[PDB]
Amino acid sequence: ISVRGLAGVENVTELKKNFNRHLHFTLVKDRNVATPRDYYFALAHTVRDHLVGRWIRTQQHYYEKDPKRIYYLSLEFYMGRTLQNTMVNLALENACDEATYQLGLDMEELEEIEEDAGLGNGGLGRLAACFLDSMATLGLAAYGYGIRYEFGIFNQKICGGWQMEEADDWLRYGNPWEKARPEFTLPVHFYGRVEHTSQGAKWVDTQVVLAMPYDTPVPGYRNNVVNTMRLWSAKAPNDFNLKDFNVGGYIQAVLDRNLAENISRVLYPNDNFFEGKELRLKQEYFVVAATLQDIIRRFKSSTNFDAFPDKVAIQLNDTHPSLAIPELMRVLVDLERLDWDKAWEVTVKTCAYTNHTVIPEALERWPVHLLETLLPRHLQIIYEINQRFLNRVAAAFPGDVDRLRRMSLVEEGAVKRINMAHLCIAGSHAVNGVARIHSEILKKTIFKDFYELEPHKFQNKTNGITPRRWLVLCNPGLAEIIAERIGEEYISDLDQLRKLLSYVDDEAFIRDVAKVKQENKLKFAAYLEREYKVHINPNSLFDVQVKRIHEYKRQLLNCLHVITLYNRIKKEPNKFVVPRTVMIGGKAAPGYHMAKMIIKLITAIGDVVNHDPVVGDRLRVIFLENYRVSLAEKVIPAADLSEQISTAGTEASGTGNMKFMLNGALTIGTMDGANVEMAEEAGEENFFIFGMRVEDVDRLDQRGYNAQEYYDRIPELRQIIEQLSSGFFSPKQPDLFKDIVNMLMHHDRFKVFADYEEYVKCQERVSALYKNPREWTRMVIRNIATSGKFSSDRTIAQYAREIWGVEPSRQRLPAP
Amino acid sequence: ISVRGLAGVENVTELKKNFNRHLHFTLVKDRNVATPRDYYFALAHTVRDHLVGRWIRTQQHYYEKDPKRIYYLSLEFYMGRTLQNTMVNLALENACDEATYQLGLDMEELEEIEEDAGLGNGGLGRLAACFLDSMATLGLAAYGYGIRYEFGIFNQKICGGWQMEEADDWLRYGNPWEKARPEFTLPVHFYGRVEHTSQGAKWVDTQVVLAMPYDTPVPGYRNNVVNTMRLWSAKAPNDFNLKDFNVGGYIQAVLDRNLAENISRVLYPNDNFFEGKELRLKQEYFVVAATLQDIIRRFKSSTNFDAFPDKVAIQLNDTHPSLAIPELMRVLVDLERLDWDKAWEVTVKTCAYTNHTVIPEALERWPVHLLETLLPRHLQIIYEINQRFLNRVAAAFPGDVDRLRRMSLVEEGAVKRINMAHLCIAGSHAVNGVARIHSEILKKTIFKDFYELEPHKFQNKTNGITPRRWLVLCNPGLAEIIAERIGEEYISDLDQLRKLLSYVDDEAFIRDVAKVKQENKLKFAAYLEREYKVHINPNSLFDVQVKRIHEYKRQLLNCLHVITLYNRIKKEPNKFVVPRTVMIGGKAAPGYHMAKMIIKLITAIGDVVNHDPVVGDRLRVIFLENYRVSLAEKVIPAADLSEQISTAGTEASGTGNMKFMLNGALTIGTMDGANVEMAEEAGEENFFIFGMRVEDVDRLDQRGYNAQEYYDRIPELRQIIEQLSSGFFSPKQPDLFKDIVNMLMHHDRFKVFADYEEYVKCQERVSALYKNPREWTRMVIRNIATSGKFSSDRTIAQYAREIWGVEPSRQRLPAP
Ligand SMILES: O=C(O)CCCOc1ccc(NC(=O)NC(=O)c2ccc(Cl)cc2Cl)c(Cl)c1
Ligand SMILES: O=C(O)CCCOc1ccc(NC(=O)NC(=O)c2ccc(Cl)cc2Cl)c(Cl)c1
Ligand SMILES: *Cc1c(COP(=O)(O)O)cnc(C)c1O
Ligand SMILES: *Cc1c(COP(=O)(O)O)cnc(C)c1O
């Protein structure tokens, strides 16, 4: 078997008896009534047993040495399953595989029983999960802090072509990885009012909600380091949530506890979109307030807070945890009694902010009346921060009255709002973009005024993904042939993949790389019929676009191409075309009408295309249901063409793109986000770039975008639009897609038509190359061998050195 | 050390390493940061490990042999802590004590960390818990079925003398004893409507709630038998509780899941009182519907249901689970398609009902409109049952039109109601009282008409308590000296206690019995200052009355005596009186105003009495806060006088009385409930009986009860009432007790004044005897030696033989 570790004689024996110990004592079952779900739990408990020893010494280590601690605050941690990832990082995969084999079980079958920890929406949440893995692998004293939702991202179901949402009860059967820590339970306050006394302000008459922490282990890759991810759960106090007497009902008082506990009930399913609901604000303060108390309690052990920034670094994953700034101030000033200026100095030096998008609708602007009611003291502090900040601006740019209002954290208008992004820039010593182009756009556009005031704050930290879960775990076959030639060191040193460049003309390697891709496609094609049922051709080109459904991602542009292909086939049926299986997957936010309309369009196209006899097996349109981390681990290693076609300037970075490049897929996309650095790394000749560049989009906006022009000059495009309009794809409901057509023609913010021509032309070129297996595979090798830069180990090493002030280390912790 | 088992060399070593295994692997802690709570969990997990082996073979045994199964349906299971009880039944107490000692820990300190499983209100719920223990000890294939409330009986707090209720979050830190069984999850239906088709009725358009079971082990006493208690938890389905589309909000849909899950959220805190709330009815159907499906699924394995009653016995603990009758019919007729008559025959033969009270306000009478909306089909079946039953009556008593309406399960009037007690008698083959006198009252009064129709159905099964938890566990010192003389066989054969009669004149025994009682009082007196703080005299007579607060229990009669004692002391300060520490404890239902007023009176008396310098240490009035099972295990073994003074005819049986008799307390009470059989067993000369007999109460009712008469003829009583009225006990609020005085004088349903004179006279006689240690102790021996009849092993053996048709067995199951 592969390099999934050694299957030692003693360890396979030890594993088996421990599996049986748990099946008996833990699951209280006996082989005759054990269900596959019991088997999955016996294994999980057995594997978890192997890292507790290391978990304890790692934490005890940090207590003894007392290094600077890194706190990663995110309202999302898209973790996925954790059994295999733990086996991989512990080098237990083969031993476990062997052991379960002897016990007569199929490890892979059991792995499929684990529920995904879908505590994230997309890119932002998965980034935090990859980062955690990298921080552990680089031996950093890091902690992931978030909310333990009992319901993560909803499960997607397609009914009559429409998306149906359903609760993600991932904790239903229990979570063997987490451990409640009811000793570090903390109180969080809401509402109340502010009393201004003789020696300071006081936040009074507040409603209390308790925060109970749950720790999950985050094992580093083969270095015996196990960091912690602490997730907070909301709990109602038993007193006041019953003790506030004078009629109401005792039963009612108890049932009403599920009101304070609703704070950690469900994840908001919005990807790159802001919804100003009170429940959302509560979740944001809740995770911030509890985390900070925990952070300071740890520090108090390790009272001059002058050394606080020397021992603490808190990274804000977007503006979601932004209340950490005014909350840090509140504690320091109100509770610790530090003077404002000393407190501000400390706050700015320990906080750092990461921006993830530039679209306006994603920007957090909280109505003042909301902050005023829920967090009265914080609003006061935000006004004071704003006051002193604007004084700094006025002093720097005397008389620039317009700049003053542009930079204010307080936005005037219909209803006053607080610009959380402005708050984060003001109270952080570093602000970074997630890709070179996005970072430049921040300085040139969105935060131009802030950049002029303090240029030193702005940086860039191009995103990355973890090679462990995104290669070794999902694509062992590829990881193996690579290791056969250049060794195993690249798993924690992705740059070494460059060494593969010297095998680009190797006849054996070319054949191998092409063989694993073929085996991956056959397995996926099988999985497709197994769990979803309705055949596909594994010899065709696997054209996949998987990410959340968004207008800016242009799944719609992909649709126009699919329809074009179909129409050309119908025109010349007996002409040869490279067969393609185009797969589109992703979830739409429940309230996103347009996004839900696009899912219906995709399934509608498939209904026509997949049943047209003249088309045969040359073209299949499939919608990938319930796209999530565990599903991504299946499609990506099987894809041939990765679609990254967002309008230039809208996708801050993207990470799915990197996942595909690492797994042997060629990329067709626009010069957007990280796409630019990928093409720059692989060489533009090895990339399928097309469409407008940021500049072209701007030029078009200056003159004005008119979709009619394109509709008029391109017959193929016009034909498609008239097909949608006439009900060619929706016979029973001829006007079903009027909203899409209307939008495309009159309010297309992402100029889908503008990139149409260059897009189908470029698609022709990839079909041409696919017709030449050898050359396609050689280009694939050029991509893989040049993907090393996109490892999150590189990203983390940069955050560590350029923002946190800590030195990464690949040193093995002193055994378990 | 005592006979808490052997501390084997190998087993103490084995215990220690397993304690450390769990502390490390399970609690992920290390000795340096382990909290006492961690230590308690390491032990619990270690002790639980010892019975899983037996749990599995016991259940596998019942599958192989396939004996008749006993299902005990109760909405309450007042279990208390379970660590020690498990050690006792497994003979692990000494080994564990030794092992923890060597590990440097105090087992008793750790035991106090366990939370009480307070899933009951009082007598009814504790009975079910004692029964479970006895059914296991007698080797019966029995299952306890109930609801797993996340909030049990509220925790009582006394503020300014008033009772304050607070949520009992007993699952906060987890329950090491239970195990979720997500494989036997079942759906339960609510609402909907009935469709009458060609081949039967159909319950349609129902709302579905899932029932998830949790199993807790019930170990028998040293016989290697471990039965199961299955508790249901309400869970919302992820579909419809989200899938019923067309606007409303996705977040809201998810948050609204806590609506279907509110069914198992909290226990109703009503003791002997009926509240017709919909949530209560839902809990009742929920436990019934899920349990029956589970029962039939088991049977289908073991379709002629003719043999159903031969393999299944379901006991109804009161009328709470009464819907099991119409639900059994529904399944048999609607689903299995059995003819009515065959279905009814089967139902009557498998169901048996237990009555627990005769007070009208405790009777379950559900409004028809409620059953009509929530369970439409059941209402139809109940009407049909009623129809055929009344036809039986009319045929038996031709022309007795009044009897017809008296016996109907349907009560006419303001709003129609269903008399659940009538339903239970009609559909059960046996109906029993809980004490000889209560059982006679059922036949002569309440169910007279039913008794005349089917005399064969009515039986008696005097309650009992388990000698394991109620002697060996709470009073090891007494259990030891008893064992020193007559052996250990009596623990599972309480009748052998009679052998103690021959030591009644033994000088050594008399001295020993008196020594353990003294050690128990010193320990309790210490515990009092430890956890509640405010001293008491251990040389005084411990006068305790602990039970739920009720007007019928007459805590008020106890109060009048306490005030009398105080007044006599004030009159003649320098006269000698036997010192007394009277302790009153118990919870009042939150909506029970009178009951809450009585708690305030008790604390008010103590305020006056405990601080009067002339009184000194001759009299202390203490209110025992948060009375519960674990607290009962502390007070009972320390009591000298047990107060069982309910008005004759109101306390069906009582069980606290038996607990006291077994632990060396003498009893002062009325000829009520089980008191009669206790005095009959010990000899009236060894009992302090007083007051009216049932007959006297009736005579008084015929002529009419006038409290004024007693107030007029007894100066001491009049003085007390004028003290309450004038604010002698409530200075700042002089009229604070007007409701009590008003009630006592004008609407005393329990004639407190009628028993006053005989009560204080009888109290004088116990004080006289207490002055003679030797004789008091000899009378105590007469009580203990004669308490054997009151073991639940006797009660269960009778239910088994006279109702269930199974033979008890004290055979050890083939090792673990
Ligand atoms: O056909 C055959 O295999 C031959 C007959 C074998 O029959 C068997 C074998 C095994 C079992 N049962 C358990 O292991 N385990 C449990 O029942 C069990 C499961 C969970 C919990 Cl919390 C507590 C228990 Cl006690 C039972 Cl009930 C019957
Ligand atoms: O003064 C002394 O004793 C000498 C210094 C000893 O310092 C120590 C000793 C032990 C520990 N820690 C654990 O055992 N255990 C944990 O931290 C721990 C607890 C629960 C969970 Cl879910 C996961 C972990 Cl990793 C730590 Cl953090 C520090
Ligand atoms: C990597 C990943 C994403 C992010 O994909 P992009 O194409 O950058 O939007 C979203 N969801 C899941 C399941 C992922 O694995
Ligand atoms: C035994 C017991 C009861 C029942 O006591 P009675 O005096 O029969 O009402 C109530 N509560 C608890 C805690 C018990 O242990």
Side-chain angles (χ1 to χ4, degrees), chain A residues 25 29 48 169 183 235, chain B residues 25 48 169 183 235:
Chain A
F25 290 99
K29 290 266 198 158
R48 161 198 187 266
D169 202 355
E183 6 174 294
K235 250 274 202 220
Chain B
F25 290 99
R48 161 198 187 266
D169 202 355
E183 6 174 294
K235 250 274 202 220

Side-chain angles (χ1 to χ4, degrees), chain A residues 23-24 26-34 38, chain B residues 48 51-64 69 143 177-181 183-184 214-217 226-228 230:
Chain A
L23 186 67
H24 188 76
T26 311
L27 273 359
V28 193
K29 290 266 198 158
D30 159 285
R31 298 295 310 240
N32 301 286
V33 271
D38 292 304
Chain B
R48 161 198 187 266
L51 69 166
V52 287
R54 279 169 264 235
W55 202 3
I56 285 159
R57 6 207 339 144
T58 297
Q59 294 316 312
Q60 99 147 316
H61 181 68
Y62 299 162
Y63 175 74
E64 308 266 71
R69 258 91 155 184
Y143 304 76
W177 310 107
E178 77 191 357
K179 169 93 220 296
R181 321 238 23 220
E183 6 174 294
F184 294 125
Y214 282 76
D215 289 357
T216 293
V226 187
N227 281 344
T228 297
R230 177 156 287 179

Side-chain angles (χ1 to χ4, degrees), chain B residues 258-293:
Chain B
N258 298 309
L259 234 72
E261 305 182 342
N262 264 353
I263 286 165
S264 55
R265 189 89 57 214
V266 58
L267 166 83
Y268 267 80
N270 296 328
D271 185 80
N272 271 278
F273 188 80
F274 173 66
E275 239 208 310
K277 306 312 235 238
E278 191 198 40
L279 187 51
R280 217 327 215 256
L281 188 52
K282 276 165 158 184
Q283 293 184 333
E284 283 177 2
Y285 182 61
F286 175 76
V287 66
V288 161
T291 302
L292 272 170
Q293 283 182 75

Side-chain angles (χ1 to χ4, degrees), chain A residues 21 24-30 35 38 48-49 52-53 55-56 151-154 164-167 169 172-173 179 181-183 212 235 238-239 242-243 245 250-251 254-255 257-258 262 265-269 279 590, chain B residues 21 24-30 35 38 48-49 52-53 55-56 151-154 164-167 169 172-173 179 181-183 212 235 238-239 242-243 245 250-251 254-255 257-258 262 265-269 279 590:
Chain A
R21 217 250 328 294
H24 188 76
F25 290 99
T26 311
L27 273 359
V28 193
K29 290 266 198 158
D30 159 285
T35 57
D38 292 304
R48 161 198 187 266
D49 269 356
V52 287
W55 202 3
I56 285 159
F151 293 108
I153 187 67
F154 67 80
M164 294 305 294
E165 295 95 32
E166 102 179 1
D169 202 355
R172 184 171 57 252
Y173 308 96
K179 169 93 220 296
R181 321 238 23 220
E183 6 174 294
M212 176 166 307
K235 250 274 202 220
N238 315 150
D239 77 316
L242 216 313
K243 127 139 124 119
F245 75 139
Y250 158 83
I251 296 288
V254 173
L255 300 185
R257 290 170 55 95
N258 298 309
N262 264 353
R265 189 89 57 214
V266 58
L267 166 83
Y268 267 80
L279 187 51
Chain B
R21 217 250 328 294
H24 188 76
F25 290 99
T26 311
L27 273 359
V28 193
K29 290 266 198 158
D30 159 285
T35 57
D38 292 304
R48 161 198 187 266
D49 269 356
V52 287
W55 202 3
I56 285 159
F151 293 108
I153 187 67
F154 67 80
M164 294 304 294
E165 295 95 32
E166 102 179 1
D169 202 355
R172 184 171 57 252
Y173 308 96
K179 169 93 220 296
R181 321 238 23 220
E183 6 174 294
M212 176 166 307
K235 250 274 202 220
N238 315 150
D239 77 316
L242 216 313
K243 127 139 124 119
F245 75 139
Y250 158 83
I251 296 288
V254 173
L255 300 185
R257 290 170 55 95
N258 298 309
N262 264 353
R265 189 89 57 214
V266 58
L267 166 83
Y268 267 80
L279 187 51

Side-chain angles (χ1 to χ4, degrees), chain A residues 131-174:
Chain A
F131 273 10
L132 249 39
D133 176 277
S134 295
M135 291 178 284
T137 295
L138 291 187
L140 290 180
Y143 304 76
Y145 270 100
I147 289 188
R148 176 188 182 267
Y149 306 105
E150 39 187 278
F151 293 108
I153 187 67
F154 67 80
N155 275 310
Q156 184 188 56
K157 284 238 180 114
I158 305 306
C159 267
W162 300 94
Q163 148 171 310
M164 294 305 294
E165 295 95 32
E166 102 179 1
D168 169 46
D169 202 355
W170 74 295
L171 298 167
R172 184 171 57 252
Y173 308 96

Side-chain angles (χ1 to χ4, degrees), chain B residues 316-586:
Chain B
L316 282 17
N317 199 20
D318 214 325
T319 66
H320 308 155
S322 68
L323 288 166
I325 282 145
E327 167 74 5
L328 186 41
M329 283 300 278
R330 193 188 64 84
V331 166
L332 290 187
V333 167
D334 287 354
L335 312 193
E336 302 293 341
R337 313 235 95 86
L338 260 71
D339 64 285
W340 189 274
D341 297 301
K342 225 287 101 157
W344 186 242
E345 195 200 331
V346 178
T347 297
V348 175
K349 262 158 95 184
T350 122
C351 291
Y353 160 57
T354 299
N355 180 276
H356 289 271
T357 185
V358 287
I359 37 192
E361 65 262 45
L363 261 278
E364 280 197 306
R365 291 169 226 243
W366 286 108
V368 158
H369 60 99
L370 248 178
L371 278 166
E372 190 183 275
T373 296
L374 196 68
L375 310 160
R377 172 95 261 239
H378 292 75
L379 216 224
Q380 279 177 6
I381 285 155
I382 287 169
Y383 277 152
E384 172 69 1
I385 280 158
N386 190 51
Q387 219 169 259
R388 313 196 169 215
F389 178 60
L390 285 186
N391 279 172
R392 248 152 74 41
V393 179
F397 309 94
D400 199 347
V401 72
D402 199 63
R403 169 174 231 114
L404 250 27
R405 63 118 208 140
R406 274 202 319 262
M407 285 178 101
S408 173
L409 319 204
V410 184
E411 278 182 20
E412 238 63 338
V415 339
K416 311 227 313 201
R417 285 169 191 274
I418 299 304
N419 187 308
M420 302 316 282
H422 287 184
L423 201 214
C424 284
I425 292 159
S428 306
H429 75 276
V431 179
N432 74 275
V434 290
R436 192 210 293 136
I437 184 169
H438 163 65
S439 276
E440 283 312 309
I441 280 165
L442 292 186
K443 291 185 270 169
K444 279 181 245 335
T445 304
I446 209 88
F447 304 140
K448 198 201 180 252
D449 295 319
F450 293 89
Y451 173 65
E452 293 177 23
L453 211 238
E454 332 181 77
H456 59 262
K457 273 183 186 183
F458 301 79
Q459 318 193 8
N460 177 249
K461 294 289 172 296
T462 303
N463 283 172
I465 52 156
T466 177
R468 267 77 67 182
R469 171 180 308 267
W470 298 120
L471 178 60
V472 183
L473 193 154
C474 60
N475 215 347
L478 176 62
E480 180 63 7
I481 66 172
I482 286 169
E484 268 168 37
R485 333 270 173 161
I486 67 159
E488 288 179 54
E489 299 189 8
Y490 77 91
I491 314 280
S492 32
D493 196 12
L494 250 225
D495 280 317
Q496 290 197 31
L497 239 27
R498 281 205 171 294
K499 294 204 252 199
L500 278 188
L501 244 17
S502 58
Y503 293 94
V504 76
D505 295 310
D506 191 316
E507 220 21 75
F509 201 57
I510 283 161
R511 186 147 42 232
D512 277 351
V513 170
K515 188 194 101 282
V516 309
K517 175 58 67 190
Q518 192 44 75
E519 269 162 10
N520 285 350
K521 303 174 58 168
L522 279 162
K523 228 257 229 276
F524 189 64
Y527 161 102
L528 238 26
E529 272 178 320
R530 260 173 63 243
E531 259 96 274
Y532 296 101
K533 310 234 159 235
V534 269
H535 204 69
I536 53 157
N537 165 22
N539 282 135
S540 55
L541 197 166
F542 275 17
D543 188 346
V544 0
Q545 184 182 203
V546 291
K547 65 245 270 102
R548 286 294 294 264
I549 303 297
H550 257 289
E551 281 169 274
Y552 91 83
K553 317 253 211 187
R554 291 148 125 202
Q555 274 86 6
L556 265 179
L557 181 62
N558 191 164
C559 284
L560 290 190
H561 173 242
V562 161
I563 293 162
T564 292
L565 252 45
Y566 173 72
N567 281 341
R568 289 167 160 193
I569 281 160
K570 293 291 287 183
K571 162 48 190 72
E572 333 209 87
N574 300 92
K575 191 243 232 98
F576 178 84
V577 287
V578 170
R580 275 165 106 121
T581 295
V582 2
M583 306 169 215
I584 305 180

Side-chain angles (χ1 to χ4, degrees), chain B residues 78 122-123 126 470 546-547 553 627-629 632 654-656 659:
Chain B
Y78 216 169
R126 204 326 122 168
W470 298 120
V546 291
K547 65 245 270 102
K553 317 253 211 187
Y627 177 61
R628 43 188 203 299
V629 169
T655 37
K659 287 165 213 182

Side-chain angles (χ1 to χ4, degrees), chain B residues 2-178:
Chain B
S2 340
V3 80
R4 323 232 268 189
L6 279 350
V9 185
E10 251 94 279
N11 254 102
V12 166
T13 303
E14 180 77 357
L15 254 13
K16 276 149 82 212
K17 31 162 293 227
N18 279 299
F19 173 91
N20 288 315
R21 217 250 328 294
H22 279 109
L23 186 67
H24 188 76
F25 290 99
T26 311
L27 273 359
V28 193
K29 290 266 198 158
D30 159 285
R31 298 295 310 240
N32 301 287
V33 271
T35 57
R37 158 113 69 233
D38 292 304
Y39 290 136
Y40 155 65
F41 275 109
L43 183 59
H45 274 101
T46 306
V47 172
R48 161 198 187 266
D49 269 356
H50 286 270
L51 69 166
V52 287
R54 279 169 264 235
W55 202 3
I56 285 159
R57 6 207 339 144
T58 297
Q59 294 316 312
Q60 99 147 316
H61 181 68
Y62 299 162
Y63 175 74
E64 308 266 71
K65 306 324 246 167
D66 193 41
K68 179 174 217 207
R69 258 91 155 184
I70 318 301
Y71 297 107
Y72 200 81
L73 269 67
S74 170
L75 256 83
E76 293 183 28
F77 281 100
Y78 216 169
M79 311 290 290
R81 303 137 152 38
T82 114
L83 175 55
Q84 196 185 352
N85 190 252
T86 303
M87 282 184 187
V88 172
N89 288 10
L90 253 35
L92 249 31
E93 201 151 25
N94 266 341
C96 283
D97 206 343
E98 177 59 41
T100 58
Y101 170 79
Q102 293 181 17
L103 257 11
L105 307 157
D106 184 345
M107 179 148 90
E108 268 189 48
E109 201 184 49
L110 268 37
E111 256 151 12
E112 288 297 325
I113 285 156
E114 180 171 0
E115 204 95 5
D116 263 54
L119 304 192
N121 276 283
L124 176 154
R126 204 326 122 168
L127 185 79
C130 278
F131 273 10
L132 249 39
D133 176 277
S134 295
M135 291 178 284
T137 295
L138 291 187
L140 290 180
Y143 304 76
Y145 270 100
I147 289 188
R148 176 188 182 267
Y149 306 105
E150 39 187 278
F151 293 108
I153 187 67
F154 67 80
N155 275 310
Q156 184 188 56
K157 284 238 180 114
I158 305 306
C159 267
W162 300 94
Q163 148 171 310
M164 294 304 294
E165 295 95 32
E166 102 179 1
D168 169 46
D169 202 355
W170 74 295
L171 298 167
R172 184 171 57 252
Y173 308 96
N175 182 6
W177 310 107
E178 77 191 357

